[PDB]
């Protein structure tokens, strides 16, 4: 087996909730690459919005601090509750970040329960997987999974009989605290996950800008790897002959993986990460003579998030 340490480029930031004391976001803006907030949770037996989420998320956005949020899961044998909780989380996220906006960072499902024997590994993973399917279908945003190394170990490494590791394609935020002497020094490779995306290495950290002992995390080498890419800039198009010539400024994200281009919302092609142009054959589209033509584009990154908005260029035609 092998393991994955942090490195000099690793990003860093806390996660917080309504019980975090004395949080000065202006101070955190100077020392944190990102902040995670609790949005909601069902740990008490019903859905509760975190009582500081709206305030915390508004101030992080105001200060330009990359901000994401998590839902504390209550899994069960009834898979309808995964759909309900996913829908509730989707609703709360928009309350915090805006209509149709689910945060700067990956939305997170926080799974820490149950730790008795009440669910089989198949039942627990099926519940998470259903939550993931609903969440991503509804938002077009990737969902990151938070859980602890101990918890994974209680559930057989999240290995499902007959099915391998169904959650191993989720981004992983793994908790393994170095303050526990029996823990390894760095996160081992587990659950079929090739890599961790974030590592929560303490629940008792000291960081200027949070008064209470705080959860601290290592992240990817680039903040871009936690966020969707930005909208494309410099979009331009012209018609010559029977072709539409489209060009744009290259997106700059470290995790950029390509672009999709559309003509009147019909797909026109997929380009790789270094691309800055496409030539489109007009005959493939119903383009009434004299009517305007909408060219639009989205970037997407390695883990499959897209530009929140599609930059547009209207050809008068």
List contacts with a second copy (CB under 8 A). 133, 136-137, 140, 142, 168-169, 243, 257-258, 260, 262, 266-267, 269-277, 279-281, 300, 302-304, 306
Q: Residue 170 annotated as binding?
A: no
CB of 213 to a second copy, least distance (A): 35
Element (H, E) at 37: strand 35-41
Taking a C-beta distance cutoff of 8 angstroms, is the pair 245, 238 a contact? yes
Q: How far apart are CA 65 and CA 24, in angstroms?
A: 12
| CA 240 – CA 273 distance, rounded (Å) | 26
- The CA-based angle 248-228-88, given to 5 degrees, is 140
Number of Cβ within 10 Å of residue 189's Cβ equals 13
Q: Give the helix/strand (H/E) hosting 86.
A: helix 80-97
Tokens of 143: 């969902």
267's contact among Mg ion, a second copy, none, with CB below 5 to 8 A by partner kind, is a second copy
Residue ranges binding Mg ion (CB under 5 A): 224, 227, 255, 301
Q: Which does 243 bind (CB under 5 to 8 A by kind): a second copy, Mg ion, none?
A: a second copy
Report, in Å, the least distance between residue 123 CB and a second copy: 19
Binding partner of 281, given a second copy, Mg ion, none, CB within 5-8 angstroms per partner class:
a second copy
Report, in Å, the least distance between residue 301 CB and Mg ion.
4
Interacting partner of 255 out of a second copy, Mg ion, none (Cβ under 5 to 8 A depending on kind) = Mg ion
Nearest alpha carbon to residue 149 among 120, 122, 178, 129: 178
Q: Which is nearer to a second copy, 238 or 267 (CB)?
A: 267
Q: Closer to a second copy at the Cβ: 41 or 228? A: 228
110 is in an annotated binding site: no
* Structure-block tokens of residue 136: 């991503």
- For 93, the 3-state DSSP assignment is helix
If the CB atoms of residues 50 and 253 are measured against Mg ion, the closer one turns out to be: 253
Sort residue 241 into left (φ over 0), alpha (ψ -120 to 50) or beta: left
What six digits make up the tokens of 214?
């705080």
Minimum CB distance to Mg ion, residue 79 (Å): 30
Q: Whole-number minimum distance, CB 67 to Mg ion, in Å?
A: 15
Please say which residue, 82 or 297, places its beta carbon nearer to Mg ion: 297
Give the residue ranges of DSSP H helices in 98-161.
Answer: 121-139, 149-154
By beta-carbon proximity to a second copy, the closer residue of 274 and 289 is: 274
Q: Which is nearer to Mg ion, 144 or 280 (CB)?
A: 144
Nearer to a second copy, 10 or 257 (CB): 257
Partner in contact with 224, chosen from a second copy, Mg ion, none, beta carbon below 5 to 8 Å by kind: Mg ion
Burial 274-312 (b: 16+ CB within 10 A, else e): ebeebebeeeeeebeeeeebebbbbbbbebebbbbebbe
Residue 227 assigned as binding residue: yes
Shortest Å distance, C-beta 58 to a second copy: 31
- Give helix then strand counts, H and E, for the chain: 5, 16
Cβ of residue 256: shortest distance to Mg ion, in angstroms? Answer: 8
Partner interacting with residue 168 (select from Mg ion, a second copy, none; CB below 5-8 Å by kind): a second copy
Asked whether 40 and 50 are in contact (CB, 8 A), the reply is yes
**Residue 241 interacting partner from Mg ion, a second copy, none (CB closer than 5 to 8 Å by kind):** none
Q: Is 99 annotated as a binding residue?
A: no
Where is the binding site for Mg(2+), in residues? 224, 227, 255, 301
């Amino acid at each position: 087996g092998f393991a994955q340490d942090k490195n000099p480029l690793s990003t860093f930031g806390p996660d917080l909730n309504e019980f975090s004391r004395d949080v000065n976001f202006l101070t955190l803006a100077k020392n944190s690459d990102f902040i995670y907030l609790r949005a909601s949770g069902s740990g008490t037996g019903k859905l509760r919005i975190d009582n500081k989420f709206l305030e915390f998320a508004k101030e992080c956005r105001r200060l330009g601090i990359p901000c994401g949020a998590y839902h504390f899961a209550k899994p069960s044998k009834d898979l309808d509750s995964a759909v309900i909780q996913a829908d509730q989380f989707i609703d709360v996220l928009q309350q915090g970040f805006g209509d149709g906006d689910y945060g700067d960072l990956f939305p997170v499902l926080d799974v820490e329960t149950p730790t008795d024997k009440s669910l089989t590994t198949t039942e627990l993973v099926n519940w998470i997987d259903r939550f993931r399917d609903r969440f991503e279908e509804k938002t077009r945003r990737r969902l990151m999974l938070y859980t602890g190394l101990f918890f994974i170990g209680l559930y057989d490494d999240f290995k499902v009989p007959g099915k391998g590791y169904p959650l191993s394609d989720m981004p992983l935020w793994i908790a393994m605290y170095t303050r526990i002497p029996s823990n390894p020094r760095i996160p081992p490779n587990v659950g079929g996950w090739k890599r961790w995306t974030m590592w929560q290495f303490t629940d008792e950290g000291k960081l200027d800008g949070v008064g209470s002992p705080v959860d601290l995390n290592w992240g990817p080498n680039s903040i871009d790897s936690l966020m969707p890419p930005s909208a494309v800039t410099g979009l331009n198009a012209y018609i010559s002959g029977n072709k539409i010539f489209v060009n744009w400024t290259a997106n700059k994200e470290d995790d950029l993986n390509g672009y999709n281009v559309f003509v009147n919302d019909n797909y026109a092609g997929t380009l790789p990460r270094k691309a800055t142009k496409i030539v489109i054959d007009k005959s493939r589209f119903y383009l009434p003579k004299g009517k305007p033509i909408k060219i639009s584009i989205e970037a997407f990154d390695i883990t499959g998030d897209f530009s929140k908005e599609r930059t547009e260029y209207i050809l008068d035609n």
